[PDB]
Amino acid sequence: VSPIIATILLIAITVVLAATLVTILGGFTHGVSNTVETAGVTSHITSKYIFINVSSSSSAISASSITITITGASFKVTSGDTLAEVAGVSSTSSNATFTGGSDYTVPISLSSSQTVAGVSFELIYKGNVIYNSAA
Amino acid sequence: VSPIIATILLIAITVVLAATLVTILGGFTHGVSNTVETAGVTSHITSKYIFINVSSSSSAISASSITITITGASFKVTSGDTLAEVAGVSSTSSNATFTGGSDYTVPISLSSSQTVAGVSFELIYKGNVIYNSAA
Amino acid sequence: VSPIIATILLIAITVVLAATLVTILGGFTHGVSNTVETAGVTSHITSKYIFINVSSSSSAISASSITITITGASFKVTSGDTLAEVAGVSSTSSNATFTGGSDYTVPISLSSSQTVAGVSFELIYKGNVIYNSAA
Amino acid sequence: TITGASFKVTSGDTLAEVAGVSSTSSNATFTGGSDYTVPISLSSSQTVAGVSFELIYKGNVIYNSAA
Amino acid sequence: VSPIIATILLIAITVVLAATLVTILGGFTHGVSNTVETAGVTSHITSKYIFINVSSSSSAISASSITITITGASFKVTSGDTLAEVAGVSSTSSNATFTGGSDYTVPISLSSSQTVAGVSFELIYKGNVIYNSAA
Ligand SMILES: *[C@@H]1O[C@H](CO)[C@H](O)[C@H](O[C@@H]2O[C@H](CO)[C@@H](O[C@@H]3O[C@H](CS(=O)(=O)O)[C@H](O)[C@H](O[C@H]4O[C@H](CO[C@H]5O[C@H](CO)[C@@H](O)[C@H](O)[C@@H]5O)[C@@H](O)[C@H](O[C@H]5O[C@H](CO)[C@@H](O)[C@H](O)[C@@H]5O)[C@@H]4O)[C@H]3O[C@@H]3O[C@H]([C@H](O)CO)[C@H](O)[C@H](O)[C@H]3O)[C@H](O)[C@H]2O)[C@H]1O
Ligand SMILES: *[C@@H]1O[C@H](CO)[C@H](O)[C@H](O[C@@H]2O[C@H](CO)[C@@H](O[C@@H]3O[C@H](CS(=O)(=O)O)[C@H](O)[C@H](O[C@H]4O[C@H](CO[C@H]5O[C@H](CO)[C@@H](O)[C@H](O)[C@@H]5O)[C@@H](O)[C@H](O[C@H]5O[C@H](CO)[C@@H](O)[C@H](O)[C@@H]5O)[C@@H]4O)[C@H]3O[C@@H]3O[C@H]([C@H](O)CO)[C@H](O)[C@H](O)[C@H]3O)[C@H](O)[C@H]2O)[C@H]1O
Ligand SMILES: *[C@@H]1O[C@H](CO)[C@H](O)[C@H](O[C@@H]2O[C@H](CO)[C@@H](O[C@@H]3O[C@H](CS(=O)(=O)O)[C@H](O)[C@H](O[C@H]4O[C@H](CO[C@H]5O[C@H](CO)[C@@H](O)[C@H](O)[C@@H]5O)[C@@H](O)[C@H](O[C@H]5O[C@H](CO)[C@@H](O)[C@H](O)[C@@H]5O)[C@@H]4O)[C@H]3O[C@@H]3O[C@H]([C@H](O)CO)[C@H](O)[C@H](O)[C@H]3O)[C@H](O)[C@H]2O)[C@H]1O
Ligand SMILES: *[C@@H]1O[C@H](CO)[C@H](O)[C@H](O[C@@H]2O[C@H](CO)[C@@H](O[C@@H]3O[C@H](CS(=O)(=O)O)[C@H](O)[C@H](O[C@H]4O[C@H](CO[C@H]5O[C@H](CO)[C@@H](O)[C@H](O)[C@@H]5O)[C@@H](O)[C@H](O[C@H]5O[C@H](CO)[C@@H](O)[C@H](O)[C@@H]5O)[C@@H]4O)[C@H]3O[C@@H]3O[C@H]([C@H](O)CO)[C@H](O)[C@H](O)[C@H]3O)[C@H](O)[C@H]2O)[C@H]1O
Ligand SMILES: *[C@@H]1O[C@H](CO)[C@H](O)[C@H](O[C@@H]2O[C@H](CO)[C@@H](O[C@@H]3O[C@H](CS(=O)(=O)O)[C@H](O)[C@H](O[C@H]4O[C@H](CO[C@H]5O[C@H](CO)[C@@H](O)[C@H](O)[C@@H]5O)[C@@H](O)[C@H](O[C@H]5O[C@H](CO)[C@@H](O)[C@H](O)[C@@H]5O)[C@@H]4O)[C@H]3O[C@@H]3O[C@H]([C@H](O)CO)[C@H](O)[C@H](O)[C@H]3O)[C@H](O)[C@H]2O)[C@H]1O
Ligand SMILES: *[C@@H]1O[C@H](CO)[C@H](O)[C@H](O[C@@H]2O[C@H](CO)[C@@H](O[C@@H]3O[C@H](CS(=O)(=O)O)[C@H](O)[C@H](O[C@H]4O[C@H](CO[C@H]5O[C@H](CO)[C@@H](O)[C@H](O)[C@@H]5O)[C@@H](O)[C@H](O[C@H]5O[C@H](CO)[C@@H](O)[C@H](O)[C@@H]5O)[C@@H]4O)[C@H]3O[C@@H]3O[C@H]([C@H](O)CO)[C@H](O)[C@H](O)[C@H]3O)[C@H](O)[C@H]2O)[C@H]1O
Ligand SMILES: *[C@@H]1O[C@H](CO)[C@H](O)[C@H](O[C@@H]2O[C@H](CO)[C@@H](O[C@@H]3O[C@H](CS(=O)(=O)O)[C@H](O)[C@H](O[C@H]4O[C@H](CO[C@H]5O[C@H](CO)[C@@H](O)[C@H](O)[C@@H]5O)[C@@H](O)[C@H](O[C@H]5O[C@H](CO)[C@@H](O)[C@H](O)[C@@H]5O)[C@@H]4O)[C@H]3O[C@@H]3O[C@H]([C@H](O)CO)[C@H](O)[C@H](O)[C@H]3O)[C@H](O)[C@H]2O)[C@H]1O
């Protein structure tokens, strides 16, 4: 009798270990994706505007998917920080897509202590910095 | 008595499980091989002929092992689709082996609607495309 | 008893899988070598002779290791197609090695329909084309 | 083991034996830096392009020239 | 009884194998680091002195971290073979760091048989040769 009953108990234990292992693996098998992007970008800064002109890109991406951050200055548009938003890009505009041939103008404001030589900015896509004016 | 008899039964069951597992593994341990090939190939297309000239290759391979496929045209030789066959390669010919220094001429025919600008072809070896004229 | 016997069977199976894998890898770990060569070569063609003059090379190599192929003409020497052989290079000759300062003369014959403007040739080493008169 | 050819040494089929390895020879041990030369013979119908061979140790194939 | 006891023994064996494997891996996971360095160096040799002038370097490094070796001559300073040591570099000296703009003078002695045309030297950092006067 007893060697067969002991075998049935060990099968029951084995299934719970396998079910446990499956939940451990689930912490590895997510959140990996191709996030690399690369663009030819040129820029010019003035007391009132930043100009951004794109010559080429690795892929065609929405101007709403790109986040812009700034130091030494402030944006004249206050709703948020996507490139489409601060640049005043309408959905019908040619500049709705970030690719070679797209140009943007961003309006900015400086304090009494701030100066043009102190201003810099960065473009971020999927958590990677794709451009930095101070490079 | 009974604990020993129960043990003999469990050994008999164990052998059949091991024999079962061996047949499961046989579905994994076959059909893996090194099929990669790479060649410097140049080509010119005309209303009557395709010319193919080889400058180098990763390995030396038989011209009968390479399959050719075509669109926008048709072959003048109708027996099949190996490179040796459609190019009229005899077994004594220098061009029996695909390597740097081997040249081939393939004769072709166009319909009333077909034109030279529409023709393209590919070379396939061991199920991989090794050249494509429209790349 | 049975969990230990099952373990011994799984070790026996494991060794055969490892031995199988070793024979799969053997199809990758051969036939890779540095075959690149590069030479400064100049040439002149006439109704009777091809002249080939070498100014520099990436390495010093035997004139018997180089294969020559021709179109629009034929060689006067019929034994084979190595450069040393068709050029009549003796083992004591200065031109036994292909390097800067080595010169070769190859004798050729044309049919009633062939002409000097139609002749061309190539030099091949380790399956790569190293010179082509029609480039 | 060999196909498409034959060994010039006929006593057997161990690597040491067909290669003519003496017990004092450097090549008595199979390791990095060991080199062997095996002499062979071809028939009137056999050719170099047809020859291939394999090395076997403890019943496993460890090398195959036709891989 | 016995299938559970056999399972407890196999767990005990498993832990010792895992502990063994951990000590095998420790032979791989050490002694890998970025040791590459690259410098623009120029030098002049005389019957009494070697002059060494640095124009640029990949990184800024201590003159005590660089080892110098010589042939065809001997150093006038006998304590050792670091660059700082044989060149007489004090800790306050500008030339304490190896970078563009650092210059060194090393005093040397020749035998009755030695001559200036026979002298050469090398600079070594982290086991890599970074300069060789006879290149
Ligand atoms: C699983 O597999 C599937 C199949 O392959 C998918 O691949 C999935 O991946 C997800 O897919 C969903 C659906 O495509 C994605 O959700 C979209 O997310 C984008 C953001 S993104 O940066 O552009 O990539 C948008 O938010 C998009 O929304 C569209 O629709 C919005 C609402 O429009 C709807 O309602 C109006 C009426 O108000 C209708 O006229 C219209 O037809 C539609 O029904 C739009 O506002 C939006 O415009 C702007 O959106 C963002 C800002 O939010 C901006 O970045 C864009 O550039 C654009 O200017 C856009 O047109 C999402 O699509 C879904 O749409 C449904 C809607 O019901 C239609 O089905 C929802 O209402 C939501 O809007 C939204 O879920 C998701 O991102 C992918 O992960 C795999 O996971
Ligand atoms: C992506 O693609 C899109 C689409 O192609 C854009 O091109 C985007 O780049 C943006 O382009 C816009 C448009 O040029 C830029 O916005 C302008 O900034 C200029 C200054 S500039 O020196 O001329 O170059 C202007 O300020 C312009 O606005 C005009 O409108 C102002 C407000 O007028 C509005 O309101 C009145 C009522 O009060 C209405 O009657 C009128 O119709 C209009 O709706 C005017 O004050 C302004 O006059 C003076 O402006 C400046 C001083 O600020 C001065 O330098 C000028 O010479 C001029 O004398 C001018 O007439 C801005 O355009 C936007 O206009 C909207 C308005 O709602 C209409 O849409 C806003 O009110 C803001 O005024 C402004 O956003 C933008 O900066 C670029 O990013 C590409 O990236
Ligand atoms: C690999 O390596 C091999 C070996 O080196 C090849 O080089 C291969 O490349 C192939 O080369 C062959 C040979 O050149 C190519 O085939 C020829 O195509 C030409 C056209 S071309 O413009 O001259 O360049 C010819 O069509 C040539 O055929 C000749 O033969 C035709 C038929 O004659 C046969 O039958 C008669 C009886 O009717 C016999 O008396 C005769 O002896 C022969 O057996 C002739 O019609 C033809 O005359 C005219 O041809 C064309 C018009 O089509 C015209 O442009 C010419 O100016 C000429 O006036 C010519 O005399 C083709 O060669 C093959 O010949 C065989 C024949 O059986 C002998 O073997 C076939 O019958 C076909 O005619 C043809 O396949 C080939 O295209 C290349 O792939 C390398 O890749
Ligand atoms: C690498 O390095 C090597 C070594 O340095 C070579 O330099 C090689 O380049 C080769 O050089 C040789 C030698 O020059 C070239 O071969 C010659 O081609 C010339 C033609 S040319 O216009 O003068 O330049 C000659 O044909 C020369 O042969 C002579 O020999 C012929 C045969 O004579 C032989 O047989 C008779 C018996 O019948 C013997 O008595 C005699 O001793 C000899 O063994 C003669 O016919 C020939 O006379 C006429 O030749 C031509 C017409 O073809 C005419 O233009 C001349 O003006 C002359 O009146 C001449 O006396 C070729 O040299 C080789 O000679 C051997 C012979 O066995 C001796 O070795 C062969 O029999 C061939 O005749 C021939 O191969 C070669 O072409 C270059 O590749 C570098 O690349
Ligand atoms: C492991 O490590 C060991 C030890 O280091 C080996 O290196 C082994 O590799 C083997 O090496 C041997 C030695 O090189 C190879 O055997 C030789 O094959 C060559 C041919 S080759 O082209 O020169 O490379 C020779 O055949 C050589 O034999 C010589 O001996 C022949 C017979 O002479 C014997 O008998 C006469 C009496 O008749 C005696 O006087 C003499 O002293 C000797 O005992 C000669 O015929 C031969 O002359 C010609 O040989 C060939 C033609 O076959 C020709 O190409 C040559 O240019 C030359 O003109 C030459 O003098 C082989 O060596 C062995 O010699 C023994 C002999 O008993 C002495 O030990 C046998 O009789 C055989 O002749 C032969 O086995 C071997 O192939 C490699 O495997 C590493 O793997
Ligand atoms: C683990 O993680 C840590 C934290 O990140 C480290 O990264 C560690 O890496 C090791 O760090 C230690 C400590 O930094 C390194 O040891 C130094 O090795 C260098 C050699 S190196 O080529 O310059 O790179 C030096 O030997 C250095 O010593 C300094 O101190 C010496 C003694 O000075 C002490 O005593 C005097 C009184 O006599 C005091 O006034 C002084 O304040 C100090 O307490 C100096 O002689 C020495 O000068 C010269 O040293 C070398 C020649 O030996 C020469 O090449 C230099 O250019 C320089 O001219 C230098 O100033 C080591 O630092 C440690 O200092 C302690 C001391 O107690 C202070 O803490 C010891 O006494 C030893 O001197 C020494 O261990 C080690 O190389 C790194 O691997 C990670 O592994
Ligand atoms: C890194 O950065 C550092 C700091 O900037 C250095 O620049 C280093 O390069 C080194 O520079 C030093 C300094 O120039 C070089 O050493 C000198 O070699 C010259 C020869 S040279 O042709 O003039 O160019 C000198 O030999 C010089 O020494 C002087 O001192 C000698 C000894 O005098 C000492 O002892 C006496 C007592 O006997 C004291 O009174 C005196 O104060 C001093 O302490 C003198 O003999 C010498 O006179 C003659 O020297 C030569 C012949 O050898 C002759 O050509 C001259 O024209 C002159 O007539 C001269 O006055 C060396 O400097 C060091 O001096 C120390 C001394 O202890 C003081 O510190 C040693 O004793 C040695 O003499 C010597 O090391 C060095 O070669 C460079 O590597 C950068 O790489």
Automatic annotation (TrEMBL), chains A, B, C, E:
InterPro entries to which the protein is assigned, alphabetical: Flagellin/pilin_N_arc (IPR013373), Pilin_N_archaeal (IPR012859)
One Pfam family, short name: Pilin_N
Keyword list, A-Z: Cell projection, Cilium, Flagellum, Membrane, Transmembrane, Transmembrane helix
Transmembrane segments: 1-28
Top-level taxonomy: Archaea, Methanobacteriati, Thermoplasmatota, Thermoplasmata, Thermoplasmatales
Signal sequence annotation: none
Native source organism of the sequence: Cuniculiplasma divulgatum
Archaeal Type IV pilin N-terminal domain ranges (all copies): 1-73
The protein's name in its UniProt record: Flagellin-like protein
